[PDB]
Each structure stands twice: as structure tokens, then as C-alpha cells.
């Protein structure tokens, strides 16, 4: 019966290790450097083991993760970019070298991973209540005649 204005859907896959990090205001790489779920929020996150469809023996390089960042991404902040990351002194002119690693890294999946390393399809549904009329409503049956 609660009808809201807007809804946003995000979908991806991560490792089964970090499942506990998905919560409003957590400490960890995923909780800050990809998305931070706000401490107050309407909506939530659903995750389920999409291992056998998204894990390859040779390494499912199709699924990749943006890894490095100097800052924590705020709630409803989107950072999608393609830049090589500098850690020690220099970004090593866009190669693989001494202490110079690339954030957009493929996971290197293996279905031979244990239960902890079983990747999860992770989706977040986000509610937005704006001054506009709430049109994304739920059905109004109506009863019989």
C-alpha cells in the first residue's frame, strides 16, 4: 500500500567473503570504495550465491571489481572510471610493475573455492520519496463485485 516516487536497482557480483560488510556504515574496502549504504535508509540489499553461473575454473575474468580508492564513496555516490592506481610513488605509466597494481581487477574465480569464497549476486533496491506524485504503487485490487 505504501506508494513511493522513485526506485533504483543496482546489481553485481562479489565474493562470499565480504557478505557481512553489507550494512549501513561498515568498515572495509567494499563498504566504502564502491558504495557506502547510508546509516538511515529506506530500501535494502538482497544477495544470493550466484557461484555456478558466475564462476569459471580458469577464472571468471568477465566479472571484475574496481578495487583501489583514496576516498570513501558516500551514499548515493557513483564512481565508475578506468584509471590505473598509484600506491608507492608513481602509477608506473600504466603497466604492471613494482608495487603498482590496477584497481579494475578481475576476481580470478574458481568453482573449486570453498564456501567462504563462493561469489554472491548482490543487488540493492533503493527507495526515493520526492515531491512528485508517488506513482510506483502497490495494485489497488480491487475486490470482487
Amino acid at each position, epitope marked *: 500500500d505504501l506508494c513511493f516516487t522513485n526506485v533504483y536497482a543496482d546489481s553485481f557480483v562479489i565474493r562470499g567473503n565480504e557478505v557481512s560488510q553489507i550494512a549501513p556504515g561498515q568498515t572495509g574496502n567494499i563498504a566504502d570504495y564502491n558504495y557506502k549504504l547510508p546509516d538511515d535508509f529506506t530500501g535494502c540489499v538482497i544477495a544470493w550465491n550466484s557461484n555456478k553461473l558466475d564462476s569459471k575454473v580458469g577464472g571468471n575474468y568477465n566479472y571484475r571489481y574496481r578495487l583501489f580508492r583514496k576516498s570513501n564513496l558516500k551514499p548515493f555516490e557513483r564512481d565508475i572510471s578506468t584509471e590505473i592506481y598509484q600506491a608507492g610513488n608513481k602509477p608506473c605509466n600504466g603497466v604492471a610493475g613494482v608495487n603498482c597494481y590496477f584497481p579494475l581487477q578481475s576476481y580470478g574465480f574458481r568453482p573449486t573455492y*570453498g564456501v*567462504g569464497h563462493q561469489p554472491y549476486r548482490v543487488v540493492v533496491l533503493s527507495f526515493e520519496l520526492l515531491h512528485a506524485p508517488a506513482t510506483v504503487c502497490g495494485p489497488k485490487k480491487s475486490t470482487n463485485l
Partner: single-chain antibody
Amino acid sequence: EVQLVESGGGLVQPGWSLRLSCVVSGLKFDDFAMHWVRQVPGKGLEWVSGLNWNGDNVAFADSVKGRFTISRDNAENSLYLQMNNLRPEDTAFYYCAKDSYYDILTGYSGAFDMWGQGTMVTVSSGGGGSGGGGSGGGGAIRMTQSPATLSLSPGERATLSCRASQSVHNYLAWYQQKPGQAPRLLFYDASNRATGIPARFSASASGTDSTLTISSLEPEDFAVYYCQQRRNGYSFGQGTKVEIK
């Protein structure tokens, strides 16, 4: 090279507050996380705490949670620890460790790539204290080393196997500690060679099993070797003390 100088140790009466410092030098410290680790005299390593390069990642030991404060400054390249309500079990040898960042989803990795000299803090002048709460952090199934203790002569090959209770993927660290001397890093990720490592030192790992081979032993290569894990609130292994037979 990175020089890590620690200060603040000595003998103190328990119960008051103390400050420990680790000053960093050698390169851009702002991009690297700093960490405290503990040494109980005559036994294995225990982790203390860790602070990220930006300070976003805060990690405290369960025993010291809620009473000890960490801080850092990337302009002067320093890490500070402020401790209160001291008890005699806190007497130890502390080490500050620089960041050795890794690349998987769970976050950055702080380990022993750049060492501090380690400083002794002895809060033992009054009566001893302890508690009856063991919890489950010390009873966890330790990564089994086969053999647990290996005493071999120079010249032959030594094999040490670290078998882990839970799946640690590829993140296991192989470490060397010279008795009375600054400990030395051996193997990143337990599977690839560290830079400048001679051919006689080799290691491999996948899942829960790791093998370390040291061919053609030398009289100076007897030390304490560690296989170390990093799942959540990372702890150290029991260590293997390889000395002369």
C-alpha cells in the same frame, strides 16, 4: 629505504596512560597504512591494531577494544597509540608495521613488509592480574605446521607445510625472525617470490595447504618461520623455531 623508529617503551606501574610512537621515513607514508603488532617474550606473535592510510579502516584487538586509542599523521609520518587502565599482561614487545597492500575484495592488507625495531613495554611493578574469560579467539584451530619444530644442519633441504583450518584463498604470509635480530619478510601470498629472494627459497600455496622449501641450508639461516593468515581480525601462527640440530 623505509626506516621505522619506535619510542615510548620502558617500565611503568600499571593503571595509568602511556603513549607509543612510530616515526616513518623512506618514502611517501601517506599512501600506506600503519599497524601495531605484539610479541609476548619467548612465544609467538599476536596482533594489536591497525589504522588505514586515510584512517578509514580502524581495527582493534578484542582485549583492548574500547580502551586503547590509535591515531596517525601522514605529514610528519607518525603513528600514535594511547593506552589506559594498564594490567600486567600488557608487558610485551611492540612492533610497528608498514602497509603491504593486496588485491582482493575484502580490503587492503597490512603486514610485515617494512619493520620497526620494536620497543619493550613492561607494565610489571605491582601485582599480577588476569581474567577467567577465554572466549574463542585463542582457542581457534591454528594453522598446523609440519613439522612443528625442525632442527636441520646447513646444506640440505628443509620443507615446512602450513595447513589452514579455513579457506584463506591465496593470502598467506611466510615470515622469518632472526633471534635477537630484526625479522625478515620471506614470501608474499605464500605463492609468489618476494623481490631479491635467492633461488633456494621457494614457496607455494592454494586454498589451505602451503609448502615452503629451503634448499642448501646455511649456518645463518636458522630462525623462526611463520605462516600468517588474514581473514578477519588477523592473527598469527604458532611459529616454527628452526635452529641447529
